[model samples]
Structure formats: structure tokens, C-alpha cells
Target chain A: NSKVKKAVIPVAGLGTRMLPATKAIPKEMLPLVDKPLIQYVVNECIAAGINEIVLVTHSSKNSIENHFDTSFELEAMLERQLLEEIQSICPPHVTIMQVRQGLAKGLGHAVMCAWPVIGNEPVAVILPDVILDEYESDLSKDNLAEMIRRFDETGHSQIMVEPVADVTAYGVVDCQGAQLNPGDSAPMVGVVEKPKADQAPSNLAVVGRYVLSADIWPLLAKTPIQLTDSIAMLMEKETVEAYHLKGVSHDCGNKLGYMQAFVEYGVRHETLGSDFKAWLESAV
Target chain B: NSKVKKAVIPVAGLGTRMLPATKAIPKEMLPLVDKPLIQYVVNECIAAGINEIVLVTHSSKNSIENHFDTSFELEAMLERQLLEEIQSICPPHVTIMQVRQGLAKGLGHAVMCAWPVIGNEPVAVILPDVILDEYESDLSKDNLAEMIRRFDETGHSQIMVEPVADVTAYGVVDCQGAQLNPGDSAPMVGVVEKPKADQAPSNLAVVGRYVLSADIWPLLAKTPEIQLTDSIAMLMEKETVEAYHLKGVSHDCGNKLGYMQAFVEYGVRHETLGSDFKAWLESAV
Candidate 1:
């Protein structure tokens, strides 16, 4: 299988949903419990063996960079006997490189902004706002590796999809055969981005994760300057296959969704889960 | 009332009780949750309107000095955007001055060792291990201020005390009349150090805290065999009037009991404590 050693995270968009709080602080830096929203996404990528992370950010996101830098005093204090407390927030390995997007374009433009760092390797693009809830297994590593394995065997780009009741808010996919298996021919018949209630082809919705060859960079670069439709137009000619995923997904973008994600992921954090759960139950 | 200003903390022990942990780290450098033991003591002193602190330390406690010093990188990194997180731990007016105690003598010797800094100014000596348990009122400030106020009015010394069921383990106090009021002149008739239960004079036991006039430093200097109880004996002989006070105290020395005290104190801390540690302790016992 091809080694997917790099990932791109788009943190450029202004968080319009969380208005006044996001005015002073970057939305990605907002603390979900003790850690920020982007940390969980980076940790998941690290678990998938992706060492190098190219963060496409704007001018207001310097906190994201400072969070990853080595703190000498903090390290010295930890060396004096606070290693457990220090390691609870940040692990050692996971190197992060940042690039400025400078504009609020579409997701395709944000992905293309990291082309210099992610040169010719097969890169994994992870949307920081989506957190996948896994149980009893490392879903990120397993699924990303499976996608890379499919690319190595069949030489086609792969997109992760899940069965959703409402595909109106996501990219809907229609397939002739079951695309759930590894070696099936289940080529993508058609895809629709944010269809209306009756216009969606099926219940399968596209998750915001993709394992793409370096060829899509050129296609994303050649897309016209159209408003309201950039990524859907760029991926029209590429041979993309969707795999149905088996994990729960959370959108940490909207207020209600972010609150639910905070409870599910924040309360289940390894260091704080049990206590937070008890406090949550008591508060109710 | 006299302006309550300065505090002296004697941290000159060899920390032989903690063995290997103290071999590399000074016992005062030990952490209580997120801060060092000295930091907590300094914070308490600061809360009591103390701006200048006299730290009676030896050569081994340089880490304590550095902890109070400013780190430019840390300040810059924290100032980038997390100002609230940075301001929570940083106290602006606290100034720490070090006094090198040359010898490993008794507690009175350590206090006398800082005579140059304490020169004729009435000072409060807070033993670093003594952490007061604060309830509805902040005990450290209220108790220390009460002693300072009484000293200002009467010009007499005060040693903080607590009633213990087992007085054999501590220096039992001999006092006459009621011991409740701060202004009452109950002369400390005698101090019996570690007396047996049957020989104990009173249940009031002395913890390691003292609000003394600067005159006691010269008396401690003339004290040939320097012991805290002996110095107190000399002070009682000269002045003929002192009081043993009953105030809430928590001594966090490097012992199993001290560790238990820290666990309990931190378990109820307003910001740091959570139900997790409380539940863990409950389950363990």
C-alpha cells in the first residue's frame, strides 16, 4: 500500500456561526474541555501514522502555531517532575507545518493552498470540524489505511461515505453495487452536492475525508472562477469511489452539534471522562 | 493599624525526610497540583497584603528563586492570545528576596539568620510547611492580621497554636484564663516541648508560625544553644507576656500525614479540585 505520510487541515474559514466568541479567538483554538477543537483532528491524523500536517490557516490563527511549538520553561518544569501533567496535553511526535490561505474560498481552494508542502505524495485531507466517534477500534487509522490499500491495488482515488437519513446537507452518492467491500468494482455512478429533500439519489452521504492522488491538484487548480460551486465542479471528471463507513460522525461547526460533540467527545476524554460524566449527570 | 507588609519564610531544611526525592529537588520545589509548595506559601503571603518576602533558603534552593523570576519566552507565549490563562498564576506585586542560612540549625537559628533583612522591622515568619485551612473567612490573612494588630497595640509577640487531642507530639502551651479572644493577655507561662500525655500542661499546641518584634532577633542571636522552644523560653523570660493562639492550620511537611493534608486541601481547592480526585480517594479508602 502507498504510504500516506501527509495530511492537510483547512482552518482558514471565518467561523461565522460562533459569532462574538470567534471574533477575538480563532474558532479552531476554542477549547473543547481542556484542548482545542483542532487538536482532536490532528491527534486522529497522528494516530493514522501521518507525521507531517500542513495547516492552511489565516492571519488570525497564530495561536494554532504557538500551541505546537516547544515550550522550554514548561518543559524544564516538567523535567523537574511534571512529565505526566505535560504529556496529558501534547504528545511528542506530530510535526505541524502551516501555510496561509489569505482568502475565504471553497474547500478545494483551501486544499490546494497546501500543494507546496504536500508535493507528490498521496495526501489525506481532514476537515477539522468533523470528529468521527469510534468504538473498540482505531477507526481513523483503519479507514485511512484501507483507503490507501484500495488506491494501491486498484489505482483510484477513494472518498469515505456513511449512510445518513438526510443526504440533503452533504454530497450524496448513487452506486450500482455495494461499495462497502474492499475489492468490489462499485464505481461511482454520480454525485450531488447538497441536494434538496426529494432530489437526493440515495441515503449515502459523503464524509469530509478523502485519499487523493497528486493528480487532483491540477484539476483543482484548473477549475473556473465560479461562485457557489467549486469542489463539485472540480471532482466531476475524476474517477472517485465511495466507501460506506461504520462509525458515528459529529459536526463541531453548528451550536447544537458542537454542544453534543462536546458532551460525547469532551466528557469521554481519557483524563477527564469519568469525572465529567458524573458531573454532567448530577447537573442534569 | 500598622500597614501589614512583609513576610519571612524559612525553607532551610535539608529535607532528609523525603530522601531520594530531595536528593535532586529541594523539598520546597515539590509541586502541589500545578504549583510548587513555595508558590502556594508565597501566594498565601501575597493574599495577606505582603509585597516583600524574605526567603531564608540555603544554596540548594536556587530553583525556588528561579520559579519566582520572570521567563521572557513564557510570558511572550502566554501573552500571544491566552492572557486570561497567564494572569491566573502570575502575581505582579510579589517580590522575593533570598537570605542564605549558613548552617543547618534549628528554626530559631534560621529566623536569626535573616537578621540583616529583618533589621528592626516587625516581621511575620511563616514556616513554609504550614498551610492554613481557609473556611468562610481567609484564615491566613485574618489570623496573621489579628496578631499584627494586637502586636501593634500591645507590643507583644504571638505564636499560633491549635488544640490537639495528642499534645505529646507537640510543644504544649501553659496559659491562664480564657484563650478565645485575640486581645486577651494570657501570658505564655511555659512551653513544654514534646511532653508525655500525663505531664502536658494544656491541650493548646504550638504550630510553626510567629509574629515577633525585631527585638527577638537579637535575643535569638545571644541564645547559645539555638532551639525554637529555647528561644521562646528566653522571650517569655524577658517580656513576661506572650499568648498561644488557636487558629486553623495545615502543615504540609514531607511526610505521609502531610501528603494526606495536601490531598485533602487540594481536593477542596476552588479552581483546581474536582469530583474526580474526591471520588478516587473515597474509592481507595
Candidate 2:
């Protein structure tokens, strides 16, 4: 079984959208409802049975590593009763390393920075900005865990795809007769980014999560600015498949997407949901 | 009823302690648990029957006003279910006004800036940096609502006092025999700021919440540089002033003190997730 044991996360982007909040704090550290956005991506990777994570980061994002590590003095200051409850911070057992992409490079070059550590193993590239919610995934097997299972069985490069109202707005994957729902899987013959909806070939848009084969290592450098170009190059060397994401996803890269995700996650959060829903009903 | 209906919340500080996070976003708008730190202050004021609030802000903190107000296109994109759920943010009924303090003078000057609208009325000056938690307020009248009642009864300038180990660190008040409990109140005969701990008169040090009588209007501008202490010192020369030891937890947010309590309080107390988040925390470790 080609179980994916390692993951590469590209988080070097300056979070230009979040602005002053990102001016000091990285976008990955911004709370998604409560926990940071990057933590969610790490959680998803761990759910898929990957242990080692290489955070492709920059200088200003030191807070990311600090978060995954311990702060001893800070913990001691909490009042007695409260201290007992929160001792366990920073995930206990995982190798989280950081590789700095010092320049203002695009996403593809950011991933190439991790090739030295990733080696020949099949790795997962989880986009911290894209937060996924696996709502009612028992039947569809559609979350990251299921995507990993499909990778183990098929041994092909897989990109999680979702159906969008406008195909032209995203990178649409031309799967071989792939259905637009959560159940089936198909091999993608071609992928095109930013083609118009009316002329676009498929309704399935490639969302920001990918499970790739080892062949992607060299092709990453071939296209320094675009991830889709390298994935296109890898598709020529081997098969590239598409797995329809089952539930909901929010792109935290933009303002509207950030607000939608914050509220959507807030809508279902345990203690806050019913009360928030009640307040929002009358208020919004 | 000389019940206070307006509050002056000074939020002009640069949040230098919080550094990078505060570089762009104002410290007052930093999230405490689910809401912004200043929201908790505003919520306390609203809970205490304050209908009108004046936020003394600076240029970078428009986000504070925006947080209390509404967002249009942002709301439209959310699924209708969620769109309908989050509208009553920052207490829709109350009137929130912002006043700019063009320069970084001091805390006293920031509060004095709101005098234009506050006028000669006895208003509540709520420190935006002070975060108070109503822990089992049901068991104790430590929340702002009860404190407002004491202000109502005395009809004198009221300041919230807490028992501190190092009285010199804060503005210590020489109360007329005030104890360390939540119920008792006392007249503050003298108040001192940053006195020596050994030379400190009493442990009843003043926290940030204040309910001042209208008589404070002239005194505010009389000494714009030195706040409550100087005004309280001057007030001692005339009218009677009192202090109340309220029952609550205060989190002074910036880095450690704020971050620790935030991490602990949200993780331990009222967050939506129970077993799941805890499990994730322990599992990640």
C-alpha cells in the first residue's frame, strides 16, 4: 500500500488579503472560527495518516512554528485550576519542519522548495488557505482520508475537485466522464485554468488540495509560477485523476470566502451553533 | 435615577506590547475568545443599561467601528442559513460613536476627547484594554450591572478596585477601611499611582472601570495628562468618592497575559466544541 506518510504545505504567501492582521500574523495563523487555518490543514493531513509535515514558510511567519511548539513560561502564568485544563498545546508527536522560501515567488516555486526533503515518496500538498468541512462523509468517502485511500488503491496523482457555478472562474479538470457528485472517481486527461464557463469543458473545478506521485518533483521547477502547469506536465508522464470533494470548502484567500467560512463553521460549531443561529436569524 | 446612560471608551493606544498584530489592526479589536476585546467592554456597558457609547479611536482602528456595524456583500455570499444567523453583531440597538484623538498623548487625554458629546452628564469611562470575565456572577454581584447599582446608590464617582499583591504597581486607593471581599464598599480618602509596594497604603488598587459624576468634566481637562488619580486627588478636596471590590477575572491582553488566558479560557470554558477540540489538542501533542 502506497500510504501517504508525508505532506508539503506552502504557506510563504504574505496573506495580502488579510492585510494588517497578516502584516504581523501570517494568514495561516488567523483563527478559523477558533483554531488557526494552517492547523486545520495539518489536522486534515494527520486524518489521512500523514505524520511528517514540511511547512513552506517565510521569515515573518515564525509564529507558525512557535504555535506547534511549547511556550513554558506562558503556561505557568495561568491560574491554578485553568492550568490543568490547557497543558496540552502544540501537537505532541509529529515532525513539523519549516523551509523558508525567501523570495516573493509563486505557489509552484514554493512547493519546489520542499523537493529536497520530500524525496521519492508520494506526498500530499495541503493548501492551508482552503479549509474543507467533511460533513456527512460516511457514505461518499469524500474527505482527505478517503482521498488518501483512493491514492493507495490507484497509485495515481489525485487533485480534489469541486463543482462550481461558474467553471470559468477556476482551474477546471477535464476528467474522463467523471460525474459531478461525491461518489465516483475518474482519470483527468486535461486541466485548464481561467477558461470561460460557456466554452469550458468540465464543471468540475480543481480545488486547492492535491495528492501527487513522486514524478511531480522535477516538473515543479519546470513551471516556477503555476502549480497547474507542473501538474499538466506530470499528467503527460503519468495519469492524473480527480476526486470530487463531498461536503463544503471555503477559500480563505479572499474577503468574502473568509467571512463565509467563519460563519459557516460558526453555524455548526458545538457550543456556539444553536445560539448563533438563533441570534443570526433575528439579527441578519 | 442618576443612572448612567453613556460610556466613554478610550481606544487610542498603539498596542505596542502586541507588536506585529497591533501594527496594522488596533489592539481594541483583537479577538478575545469569540468577540473582540473591546466588544466585551461594550457588552458589559450595554448589560449595565448603557444605551449610547463613544469609542475614542485612532486612524488605524476603523475596524472597531466596522466590527460594531454591518457588512453587506460579505453577508450576501454566506449560505442563507448562516446569513440569517450572524446579523445581530455588536449589539444592534445601541448607538456607537467614534471620536479621534489625533495624537498619542496619554490615556487621560483620550477620555477627555469624548467630552464634546458626553457634555456635563455623569458618564461611564470604560477602559477598552480592560477585559473582565463574569465567572459565576450568579453567585456573586461582580459583573458591571451590580457595580452600576452601587454608582446609583452613592451618587459619587465610583471606581472598581481589586485586591492586588503589589499595590504599588497600580493606582492604589486609601479606602476608609475597605475589605478584600466582593460585597463591601468604602470611600476612597486618597489615591496614588505607582507608589512603592512597601509604602503602599492599602491593597485596594483601582482597576480600569469607572463611573464618574458630572463634576468630572472640568477636572478632566484641568489635568489632561494625569487621569483618575489626579482627578480623584482633586475630587478628594471636595465631593466624596467610593471604591467597590467587584468579583470577576481580568485579562490584560497583548502577548502572554492576554494570550494565556485566551488559550485557556476558550479551550476550557464556553467554546462550541467539547470532546473534539480537547481530543485534537491532546492528539496533536
Candidate 3:
């Protein structure tokens, strides 16, 4: 079936959490292994059949755009094999465009800036901070692809969710006892924003991945400067489904999570992984 | 005392040794631990009383310039404590400047590019690839500081030397058997470039650090693809060139294994992450 043709990634937030390093370098440009953090997110979007990537960035964040852009001089310096790798950061089929947020606004405001490019079409909003690894998972998790397919099949918007023990810290989704399982979706009634432990409807927490229907743009244009509220607002008219993300998700926005992701990615890396793992084994 | 006021670092070479990693990032910009490789060199220059750093860079390497430049918006977002750290990448006294080499040339040609900025002043030529650690040495080795002192005292061009097992691969100094000691300098007659072990004059190979006199500028300008050693040899013909045996640890960050060695050494020694990283490393390994 038809897949989502475009994806919006909001990279306007100043990553103050990962300070000093993020002071000069955008947190998105920080290397996970050899590749920058944003590259992983971009590659995932492309792998999930998104051809157009619209980055909602700020003025200070030119490095993000520069990382994906072609450098003829840098390419000339590399050998043929590595030259291909440098040139192929963004493939010929995929087009990358940027829209400035102008100010340090919240995530919802960043996505709204993409209206000029996205128009009234359904678009997937991927948080560049949260990188998911689908390759190693046994769930055969094509969560984003399946969400696109499901959107085509039922016309219901998709929001990725994962079960959490402490629902108090997350935007918990209320599915009304639908028993949402892994690699499946359930119709959500509303999302409670960090509800108290006893008062929370379910343990399923709404994460960073979203496939928004055309209805969200107008709602996002309204007072709900948060995407979670915009999704809940859209739920009044259009049905929104919560698909549990089967693969492991790394929240690289914070230091601990970033370190976890670094080590995990470092150990599993094709060339450096074995040595790194061995080093870790002996080092520990 | 007037110390070496300016230093020229040639960062124009293609880091083919560190491919793929060096494809996008300049080798000078590669992270040793947290700080960049070039930053270490710059810090060493600053620590040794050099005020101006002239990076002989290429057009492709803007990241090196940007790394030391102030980020107003990024600075505004950080907390006061961390903000100070970001702002102090370069101090008020130290000024970092860049001059384009324009082409792929040898070390002498790269140093020659700095002639416009340097004028006729005695300048230091530090290879950014070779990072010297003066703090950890038991010898209390202020090799660069001592070299600068020696330059100020005797007005001799100082070339740093370290004893290598095999001198065949390096530019061995012909000290004329004056008994060159670590942390001290001796007059060099000539530099034998890659001489056989039997024919070698000394085991002291010339490492990356050099404090050249004003006399080198004229000698460096004559050649197209100039080598610094050739210019040094010419300077030796007229002026007194002394070899200073280094008493500190120097890491060649130009290659992969060497970079890894430096990374592991710096990683476990990092202030914030050292103990925690070492703990995790101990468990993980």
C-alpha cells in the first residue's frame, strides 16, 4: 500500500542537557559511533519510505543542515570508496529541506513551521532525539512502515507507544482496557499528561514517534503548542491509534540515555563492535 | 622575557591514514577524548606562553575555526557554570587566527604560508597531529617552556628530539656527539633524513615540535613543494640549530591505533567521567 511520503523532524531545541559538548556542536551533530545522531533518525525515516525530510531548525543550528549537505571539497579529499559514503549521506531520491523556527519554541511550534512544505498532507513527525533500532529486534518491527500501512488501511492516525512501569513520568495513553500488545495498535481515547500513579488509566506511554492525519495541523495551529495535546484535540473528530513500538528506543536527549545508546551502538557496530565489546568485557 | 609570540600549525594535509573518520571531519578536529586533537596542541601552545595561534588550514576545514569561535546563542542557553567553560575555549589573552595554505604542500610550504601573518618574528611550528603531554611527566618537563627560554637566552632555533629504537624512519639529528640529554639542547650540525642505523649520526629522531628562528622564512620561500627539514638544513648551514631532547609523552594522533591509544589514556584520566568510565570499563571488559 501507499506509505507516508514525508517526515518532519524538529531539531530547534537547545540541548542544554548535554552541555559543554553541545555548547559548540548541536546535540544532533554529536556522533553516535561514526555517524551523527540526526543521521540515524534520517536513515530510519528513509528506510520507512519517507522521501522528503523537512527539518524545523533554528538559526544557530546550521551544522545539522551542513552535515547532510554535500561537501565537494571534503568529497575530493576522500578515496573512491569513502567518497561514495560521504556523497550518499542523503540519497538522490530523498530531498532534504529546512524551515526556521526563529525562536526557541516548543516541539509543537517547531512542527507547525513545516506547514509551508507539508501543506494539508498526512506527515510523520519523528523526534531526532529518540533513535530506534529495528534491525536487531525479533518483533520484526517495521513500526513506522506498519503505521503508514495502517493509516492507508483504516485512515486512523498513528502514535507510537511503549509500556512503562512508571506511567507518572510519561504522557500515558488511555485505551479503555483494550489490552494493547507489542507490534499492535489499539484505539486511544485520550492521553493523560504525566498523571499520578494511581490515577493513570494505563501503563502505555506515548513516545516520540507520530503519524499525524491532516486534521492535526489546524489543531496544532490553535493554542495547543504541545503535540500531545494537539493529538488529543484531533482525537475528538478523527480516530487516533496507539501502536506499541516493538524495537528498542534510545532517548538521546539526556546524558544517561545518550551514554546507554552510545555503548549499545558501539558494541553492536560491525567493525568496532567486537573490539569495543571485548574491551568492555576486559575493561569492566 | 619575550617568548615565542606566535605558533603556526599546518592542518592542510589529507588524513588518509584515518579514512572514513577523516572524510567529513578534519583529522585536527577528531576527538581524542572530549577535547579535539587540535585543541590539545593549542592548549600546549598557550600553556607554553604562545599568545597567537596561526592555523595553516584549507577551505574545507571550517570546523576547526568554528570550534574555537564564540557561539552567542549557544552560550546564552547554557547555565552559568557550564557557560563559563564554553566561553573560555580561548582565553582573552590568546588569539586564534587562520591562514589558508591553498594547496596540498609539504610542511615547509605550509609554514611559508604564515609568512604574511608572522612577518620576521621567531615563531613556533607545532604539528597538531603530535600532542605532547607535559603535565604527567615525572621529569617536570616543560620542554616547550625550556625551549622558549633557551631561544630567549641563546637565540637558537630549537628542534624537539626523542630517542627512537629505529632511527631509519625519522629525521635523525647529527648532534656531532655533543651528548644531548633529555630536557636540554645541543648544537646540531645537520639532520640526516632516514639514514641507515649503521650510518646514523644519532638515535635522537626529530619529533613534531619545532621553534624556528626568523632566518628560516627566507630559506622556506625558495621551494615549491618544500619540506621543513630542508629549510632546517639550510638554516643549519648559517645559524645555530639545537636539538632539545623532550622529557614528556607525545602521542601521534595521525594514525588509528595511535589515536586509540591516546583515547584510552585520556578517557580514563578525564576529570568528570574518569572514575565512572573506568568503573564501567572494568565491568564491561
Number of the top-ranking candidate, with TM-score as the measure: 3
Q: Please, what are the lDDT tens digits per residue for candidate 2 over residues A135-230?
A: 545422456777788888889878988899988798898876656568456889888888875667788888788888888877775643678888
- Note the DockQ of each predicted structure: 0.03, 0.05, 0.26
Off by over 4 Å in 3: A138-141, A162-182, A192-207, A272-284, B12-27, B30-34, B60-63, B133-143, B161-207, B237-251, B256-265
lDDT of 1 at B66: 61
Which lDDT tens digits does candidate 1 get at residues B1-285? 454367888887755544223433456755443345676677767766677889888764665676566533334433233444434443676678888887657788887777787587777888876666555336544666667777777878877777774767888778854455532335677788898878877787776767787667767766644676677777788785466454555655555335433534454452523455445434433
Kindly provide the TM-score of model 1 when superposed on the true structure, using C-alpha atoms: 0.50
What is candidate 1's CAPRI-style docking category based on DockQ?
A: incorrect
- The C-alpha TM-scores of every prediction are 0.50, 0.57, 0.84
**Stretches > 4 Å off in candidate 1:** A1-284, B1-4, B79-90, B177-185, B279-285
The 10-residue segment with the lowest total lDDT in model 2 chain A: A81-90
Best candidate (score: lDDT): 3
Identify the superior model by TM-score, candidate 2 or candidate 3: 3
Q: Model 1, residue A40: what's the lDDT?
A: 69
